[PDB]
Design an enzyme around this catalytic site. Structure first.
Site, PDB file in Angstrom:
ATOM      1  N   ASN A  58      14.856 -94.849  13.837  1.00 49.65           N
ATOM      2  CA  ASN A  58      14.461 -94.763  15.222  1.00 49.65           C
ATOM      3  C   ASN A  58      15.628 -94.860  16.194  1.00 49.65           C
ATOM      4  O   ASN A  58      16.448 -95.723  16.090  1.00 49.65           O
ATOM      5  CB  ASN A  58      13.406 -95.844  15.506  1.00 49.65           C
ATOM      6  CG  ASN A  58      13.083 -95.981  16.964  1.00 49.65           C
ATOM      7  OD1 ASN A  58      12.586 -95.064  17.581  1.00 49.65           O
ATOM      8  ND2 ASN A  58      13.376 -97.122  17.526  1.00 49.65           N
ATOM      9  N   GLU A  59      15.664 -93.937  17.129  1.00 46.09           N
ATOM     10  CA  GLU A  59      16.567 -93.914  18.273  1.00 46.09           C
ATOM     11  C   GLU A  59      18.116 -93.889  18.016  1.00 46.09           C
ATOM     12  O   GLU A  59      18.872 -94.571  18.663  1.00 46.09           O
ATOM     13  CB  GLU A  59      16.053 -94.867  19.436  1.00 46.09           C
ATOM     14  CG  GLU A  59      15.091 -94.165  20.463  1.00 46.09           C
ATOM     15  CD  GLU A  59      14.040 -95.041  21.183  1.00 46.09           C
ATOM     16  OE1 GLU A  59      14.166 -96.258  21.017  1.00 46.09           O
ATOM     17  OE2 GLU A  59      13.099 -94.548  21.901  1.00 46.09           O
ATOM     18  N   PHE A  60      18.566 -93.039  17.095  1.00 44.93           N
ATOM     19  CA  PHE A  60      19.996 -92.886  16.776  1.00 44.93           C
ATOM     20  C   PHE A  60      20.792 -91.856  17.569  1.00 44.93           C
ATOM     21  O   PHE A  60      21.612 -92.207  18.346  1.00 44.93           O
ATOM     22  CB  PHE A  60      20.159 -92.502  15.310  1.00 44.93           C
ATOM     23  CG  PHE A  60      19.922 -93.614  14.361  1.00 44.93           C
ATOM     24  CD1 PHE A  60      18.652 -93.921  13.945  1.00 44.93           C
ATOM     25  CD2 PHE A  60      20.964 -94.357  13.882  1.00 44.93           C
ATOM     26  CE1 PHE A  60      18.419 -94.961  13.077  1.00 44.93           C
ATOM     27  CE2 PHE A  60      20.741 -95.408  13.009  1.00 44.93           C
ATOM     28  CZ  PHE A  60      19.464 -95.711  12.609  1.00 44.93           C
TER      29      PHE A  60
END
Ligand SMILES: *[C@@H]1O[C@H](CO)[C@@H](O[C@@H]2O[C@H](CO)[C@@H](O[C@@H]3O[C@H](CO[C@H]4O[C@H](CO[C@H]5O[C@H](CO)[C@@H](O)[C@H](O)[C@@H]5O[C@H]5O[C@H](CO)[C@@H](O)[C@H](O)[C@@H]5O)[C@@H](O)[C@H](O[C@H]5O[C@H](CO)[C@@H](O)[C@H](O)[C@@H]5O[C@H]5O[C@H](CO)[C@@H](O)[C@H](O)[C@@H]5O)[C@@H]4O)[C@@H](O)[C@H](O[C@@H]4O[C@H](CO)[C@@H](O)[C@H](O)[C@@H]4O[C@H]4O[C@H](CO)[C@@H](O)[C@H](O)[C@@H]4O[C@H]4O[C@H](CO)[C@@H](O)[C@H](O)[C@@H]4O)[C@@H]3O)[C@H](O)[C@H]2NC(C)=O)[C@H](O)[C@H]1NC(C)=O
Ligand SMILES: *[C@@H]1O[C@H](CO)[C@@H](O[C@@H]2O[C@H](CO)[C@@H](O[C@H]3O[C@H](CO[C@H]4O[C@H](CO[C@H]5O[C@H](CO)[C@@H](O)[C@H](O)[C@@H]5O[C@H]5O[C@H](CO)[C@@H](O)[C@H](O)[C@@H]5O)[C@@H](O)[C@H](O)[C@@H]4O)[C@@H](O)[C@H](O[C@H]4O[C@H](CO)[C@@H](O)[C@H](O)[C@@H]4O[C@H]4O[C@H](CO)[C@@H](O)[C@H](O)[C@@H]4O)[C@@H]3O)[C@H](O)[C@H]2NC(C)=O)[C@H](O)[C@H]1NC(C)=O
Ligand SMILES: *[C@@H]1O[C@H](CO)[C@@H](O[C@@H]2O[C@H](CO)[C@@H](O[C@H]3O[C@H](CO)[C@@H](O)[C@H](O)[C@@H]3O)[C@H](O)[C@H]2NC(C)=O)[C@H](O)[C@H]1NC(C)=O
Ligand SMILES: *[C@@H]1O[C@H](CO)[C@@H](O[C@@H]2O[C@H](CO)[C@@H](O)[C@H](O)[C@H]2NC(C)=O)[C@H](O)[C@H]1NC(C)=O
Ligand SMILES: *[C@@H]1O[C@H](CO)[C@@H](O)[C@H](O)[C@H]1NC(C)=O
Ligand SMILES: *[C@@H]1O[C@H](CO)[C@@H](O)[C@H](O)[C@H]1NC(C)=O
Ligand SMILES: *[C@@H]1O[C@H](CO)[C@@H](O)[C@H](O)[C@H]1NC(C)=O
Ligand SMILES: *[C@@H]1O[C@H](CO)[C@@H](O)[C@H](O)[C@H]1NC(C)=O
Ligand SMILES: *[C@@H]1O[C@H](CO)[C@@H](O)[C@H](O)[C@H]1NC(C)=O
Ligand code: NA
Ligand code: NA
Length: 917
Positions: free
Chosen positions: A463-465
């Protein structure tokens, strides 16, 4: 020679602390917090300020000790195995006072040979598991100069720091919607397995891969190709050479209907794995489709492993499977797509059995801080709410944990696609050989475990990289960035994609939840997925949209909304109901800005272990400004009522805002971006607190799920208001796979219900024609130049759509009738000159319907509240009522503790009730 199994749930357990001063009865599966609470040592963990108050539990070790285990054969001829489906997290496993294992992953199945410890035992063996204090162990890991360190902004905590070092559910250390309990214990089932020489084997894990012949991850399969059923069985212990494999594939509904019965070909075997496959004719199996896209056809596959010179099989594994293809498309927008009018760039959509569909849903977060207490009833009730809201997809958010088999079973049966993720979230992770090896074990186990599930839609690395954390790292430390980017590719692409590709041909991959897609996919490349990253061209559209804007002045301005392929995240926080607050917070703390209410608001997070009033107040302010700008501000003489009304007002804003976003994203399907999905942030609550959730902790519906249910309907009429230009646009959007025709009723009335002269210059009714997964503009009017409204603050446009068409894959000749109810207010809700609508409520015990009537005038945001003691949801809520219109509202009753009396306690209200004393 059958396998002797002792379930660890049936053994007597005792829980002890680090200091020998606390001793309570234990359960298996369980966690220390739950056993402490069941014994009365602590109050319910979700209550008051327990997030702070209970930190002494997570700060120490907890040991689960069994009473001596009877019934185990002492014959040295028998291999005794401890099998754990989940231990959370760092543990020391002792069998007869001998350490036999030291597990360090919540997401792995651990198995230890305890034959020698058993043989050495003077009496019946005692099994003990000592669970470490996770914050202590991670702090010690970080403290070493020999390990990797990242800039402060990269590893910035919610509550507990150093979470990147542990393979444990990341939200256990706190999140912006949840507490930081860091629970420990045997979180999943466990077993003792006794195997006899030359006898039956034990099934550890089974990977079933059903794909089209020639299918590869991330590429569109051939829908005319035969089906390939690949069965790979992990086991304990000794399987003899020249092993034979046979399958029986029967209908999951009817055992008598046999799809395939026969042997498997190309059999391969190792120390602990046996694999084989069968090719079935393309025409034979009935396809699985998500809900409202056809039938959820499932099959029961039983794989039998026999040895040369054995009449009976020695290994038998069963799984429920579906015959379907699910593609996550993230490659370049093709020349054919460009020619059709689609903006170039990269795709971000899903395809079921070769058909594009518009994805509708939300993000699923863990429903409880303690997974062991999450029941079948709780999840089935959540799923009822998911279906009722007209979802076809949930994004199983990381991290989060890998959902157990039983939850995916629910989704399989119901037809809800699950966009799944690996447990890496909102931070950068280490890439040491040992960490990578531990991750490989977790990825190999879960990919193999979950592959058989028809509901599994895709796997995403984390998530969210690429959209957040990596750009943060480039800014925070430009010098170390290429190294850190290299580790990301090494772990999330090179390793992870390879582990997935090896164990699945059917499930597509993305290294993270949000990115600009891929340039190339090729296993021959040193980095198998060549990411586009920021190799973008102006005007081109790439990836999904992950959008939050807390400036309330632009909340309903569409020019502020992102233009993308898919919307995977979007939202704004709201207060839960007073009924939900009352479950966890003291009566004296039932006020908007009480110290307990503020401290439970984790938007924004503490960024450490402090009682951060400042950061939490930021979220409280956001909710306050949102209400103040657009909604009537309550001022009730009763503080209880004042709190409740303010809570409700925050919910009105949240609902309307998401609606404004959903209709915009949905309309995009027919626009050059060719938008194909909406997943709002977030579906559910982990506890009683102000969050982005639509469903409260006990399942209660906020205003949001009622508005999103309507906005997620197959055919919708949406009102778009350019308030700066004073222009109104009404569009019709359909997610059906065939064109539909219909009509939209447009009634302009004043707030008393009296019609506006000449229907304010607008047509009373209009016909439409909307294409498959497309939109059409039906009305365009300037509220000043083209319309004649005498008073904009004494006007409402009631929108009623009727259409006739067929759902995908419907056998039926009979066309379905689609209806959508909506409204347009030419002023903000706080400007509408509402008067008491004089609402009448009644319940009919035979029809099980509530009748709601507005008697004196127009009722806006008509709201029904069910009391505590009952679980479920109304068939509609937060609707417009014209006087004399008798509205029938049913209720899906999931649970009742009132003996039917709850119906007398149901209340009705409207926008008007916000401003009465
Ligand atoms: C069905 O299904 C199935 C599945 O289920 C499948 O199969 C698959 O396949 C795949 C493909 O091939 C594969 O993959 C691979 O892998 C490898 C490794 O291997 C190893 O391991 C594995 C795993 O293991 C684990 O698991 C299992 C299961 O569970 C078990 O059994 C075991 O025991 C283990 O376990 C453990 O661990 C884990 C973790 O991991 C945990 O979890 C647990 O608990 C425990 O602890 C295995 O499997 C294998 O085994 C194998 O092998 C052996 C021998 O060796 C045998 O005995 C067995 O039997 C098996 O075999 C199989 O396979 C093979 C292959 O491998 C074949 O041949 C045979 O026949 C059979 O079938 C082992 O042990 C890795 O390594 C690899 O690699 C890769 O590759 C790729 C492609 O493929 C690429 O892309 C990449 O890159 C890589 O490569 C690279 O490297 C190499 C070397 O290393 C080279 O050669 C190459 O070339 C490359 O390199 C290059 O390039 C680069 C760039 O790119 C550069 O840099 C450089 O320089 C160069 O140039 C792969 O991945 C897998 O494995 C399989 N699996 C199984 C199970 O089997 C099938 O196929 C299906 N079917 C149908 C019909 O479809
Ligand atoms: C609270 O709970 C925790 C967790 O359950 C308890 O800590 C655990 O304690 C047990 C028993 O002491 C340890 O078991 C092993 O102990 C030694 C190894 O000692 C060495 O390594 C450990 C661990 O180092 C890692 O963790 C620390 C953080 O604490 C970190 O600083 C360090 O860098 C290491 O981290 C790396 O590795 C881990 C994976 O292990 C990764 O998760 C990390 O990411 C990172 O890569 C240190 O704490 C020590 O100071 C020391 O350096 C080992 O010798 C033991 O070996 C026995 O058991 C194995 C089976 O597992 C067997 O094969 C061996 O033959 C041996 O068995 C024989 O001996 C025993 C008696 O020891 C006897 O009964 C048997 O019958 C046999 O004859 C064992 O593997 C465990 O490692 C440790 N876990 C952690 C995370 O620290 C803690 O004690 C407890 N406290 C209280 C008050 O109750
Ligand atoms: C609960 O918590 C807050 C306690 O400090 C309080 O916040 C304050 O809210 C007012 C509006 O009610 C803000 O006043 C200003 O807000 C904006 C910001 O520039 C202006 O546009 C307004 O015209 C107005 O001047 C305060 O700024 C704000 N205080 C802080 C510290 O941000 C909430 O109002 C309280 N909520 C309830 C419902 O009681
Ligand atoms: C109901 O709640 C509102 C909001 O918390 C209260 O309004 C505040 O009243 C105080 C009175 O001292 C003012 O100083 C604040 O500026 C007001 N805040 C807002 C956001 O308007 C209101 O007083 C409460 N009604 C009651 C209990 O009569
Ligand atoms: C247990 O003992 C420790 C000191 O060894 C102490 O700090 C803690 O308060 C004690 N707890 C109880 C419940 O007695
Ligand atoms: C991690 O370790 C470094 C170096 O020992 C230290 O400066 C830092 O404070 C540690 N971080 C935390 C949150 O404990
Ligand atoms: C099929 O298997 C499932 C478990 O996966 C089981 O609940 C069901 O009863 C089975 N049905 C038939 C007809 O075998
Ligand atoms: C949260 O609190 C920390 C510590 O005071 C602070 O540095 C950080 O900026 C705060 N977060 C926000 C969003 O303001
Ligand atoms: C949507 O409909 C328009 C006609 O109204 C058509 O030109 C366009 O190609 C359609 N788009 C899709 C993706 O079907
Ligand atoms: Na171009
Ligand atoms: Na997030």
């Amino acid at each position: 020679g059958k396998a002797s199994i002792h379930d660890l749930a049936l053994q007597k357990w005792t829980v002890t602390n680090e200091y020998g001063n606390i001793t309570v009865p234990g359960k298996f599966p369980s966690q220390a917090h739950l056993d402490l609470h069941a014994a009365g040592v602590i109050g319910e963990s979700n209550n008051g300020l327990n997030d702070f108050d209970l930190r002494w539990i997570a700060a120490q070790n907890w040991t689960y000790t069994s009473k001596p285990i009877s019934g185990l054969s002492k014959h040295s001829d028998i291999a005794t195995w401890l099998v754990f489906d989940g231990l959370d997290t760092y543990a020391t496993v002792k069998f007869c006072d001998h350490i036999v294992g030291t597990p360090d992953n919540q997401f792995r199945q651990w198995f230890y040979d305890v034959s020698s410890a058993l043989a050495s035992c003077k009496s019946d063996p005692v099994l003990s598991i000592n669970f470490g204090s996770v914050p202590r162990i991670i702090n010690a890991i970080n403290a070493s100069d020999e390990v990797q360190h990242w800039p402060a902004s990269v590893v910035y905590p919610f509550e507990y720091p150093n979470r990147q070092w542990v393979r444990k559910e990341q939200n256990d250390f706190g999140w912006d919607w949840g507490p930081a309990f860091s629970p420990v214990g045997p979180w999943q089932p466990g077993r003792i397995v006794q195997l006899s020489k030359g006898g039956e084997l034990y099934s550890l894990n089974t990977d079933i891969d059903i794909f089209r012949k020639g299918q590869f991850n991330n590429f569109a399969p051939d829908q005319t190709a035969p089906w390939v059923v690949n069965a790979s069985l992990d086991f304990l212990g000794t399987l003899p050479k020249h092993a034979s494999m046979s399958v029986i594939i029967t209908d999951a509904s009817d055992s008598r209907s046999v799809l395939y019965s026969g042997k498997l070909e190309g059999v391969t075997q190792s120390d602990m794995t046996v694999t084989g496959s069968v090719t079935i004719d393309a025409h034979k199996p009935k396809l699985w489709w998500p809900r409202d896209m056809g039938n959820q056809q499932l099959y029961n596959i039983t794989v039998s492993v026999s040895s040369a010179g054995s009449k009976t099989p020695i290994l038998v594994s069963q799984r429920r499977v579906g015959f379907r293809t699910i593609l996550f498309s993230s490659g370049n927008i093709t020349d054919a797509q460009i020619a059709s009018g689609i903006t170039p760039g990269n795709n971000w959509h899903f395809e079921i059995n070769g058909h594009e569909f518009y994805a509708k849903g939300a993000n699923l977060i863990p429903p409880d801080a303690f997974w062991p207490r999450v029941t079948s009833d709780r999840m089935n009730r959540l799923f009822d709410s998911v279906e009722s809201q007209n979802f076809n997809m949930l994004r199983v958010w990381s991290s989060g944990t890998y959902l157990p088999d039983w939850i995916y079973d629910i989704a399989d049966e119901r037809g809800v696609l699950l966009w799944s993720e690996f447990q890496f979230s909102d931070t950068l992770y280490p890439d040491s050989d040992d960490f990578k090896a531990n991750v490989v074990g977790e990825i190999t186990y879960n990919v193999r475990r979950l592959n058989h599930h028809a509901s599994l839609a895709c796997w995403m690395g984390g998530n969210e990289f690429e959209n957040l954390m990596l750009p943060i790292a480039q800014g925070a430390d430009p010098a170390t960035y290429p190294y850190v980017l290299g580790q990301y590719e090494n772990l999330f692409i090179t390793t992870l994609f390879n582990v997935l590709a090896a164990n699945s041909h059917s499930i597509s991959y993305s290294p993270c939840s949000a990115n600009n897609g891929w340039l190339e996919i090729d296993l021959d490349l040193p980095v198998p997925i060549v990411e586009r990253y920021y190799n973008t061209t102006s005007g081109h559209i790439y990836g999904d949209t992950d959008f939050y804007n807390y400036d309330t002045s632009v909340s309903f301005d569409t020019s502020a909304y992102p233009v993308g392929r898919f919307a995977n995240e979007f939202g704004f926080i709201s207060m839960p109901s007073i009924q939900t607050w009352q479950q966890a917070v003291d009566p004296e703390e039932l006020s908007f800005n009480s110290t307990t209410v503020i401290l439970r608001n984790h938007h924004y997070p503490a960024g450490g272990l402090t009682r951060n009033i400042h950061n939490s107040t930021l979220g409280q302010v956001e909710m306050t400004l949102a209400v103040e700008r657009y909604y009537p501000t309550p001022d009730k003489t009763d503080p209880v009522a004042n709190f409740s009304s303010w809570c409700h007002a925050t919910q009105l804003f949240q609902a309307d805002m998401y609606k404004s976003e959903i209709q915009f994203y949905r309309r995009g399907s027919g626009l050059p971006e060719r938008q194909l999905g909406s997943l709002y942030w977030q579906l559910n609550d982990i506890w009683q607190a102000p969050t982005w959730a639509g469903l409260e902790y006990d399942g209660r519906w906020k205003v949001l799920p009622y508005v999103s249910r309507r906005t997620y309907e197959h055919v919708i009429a949406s009102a778009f208001w350019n308030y700066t230009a004073n222009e109104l646009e009404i569009w019709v959007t359909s997610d059906l796979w065939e064109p539909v025709a219909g009509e939209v009723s447009l009634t302009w009335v004043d707030l008393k219900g009296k019609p506006i002269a000449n229907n304010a210059g607008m047509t009373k009714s209009t016909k439409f024609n909307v294409g498959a997964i497309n939109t059409t503009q039906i009305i365009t009017a300037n509220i000043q130049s083209d319309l004649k409204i005498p008073d904009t603050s004494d006007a409402v446009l009631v929108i009623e759509l009727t259409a006739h068409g067929k759902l995908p894959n419907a056998a039926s000749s009979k066309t379905t009738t689609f209806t959508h109810h909506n409204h347009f207010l030419p002023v903000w809700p706080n400007q509408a000159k509402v008067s008491d609508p004089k609402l009448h409520l009644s319940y009919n015990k035979s029809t099980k319907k509530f009748t709601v009537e507005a008697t004196a005038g127009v009722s806006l945001y008509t709201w029904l509240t069910h009391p505590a003691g009952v679980l479920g949801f109304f068939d509609d809520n937060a609707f417009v009522l014209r006087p004399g219109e008798k509205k029938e509202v049913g209720f899906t009753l999931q649970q009742d503790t009132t003996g039917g009396k709850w119906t007398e306690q149901v209340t009705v209200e409207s926008l008007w009730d916000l401003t009465t004393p």
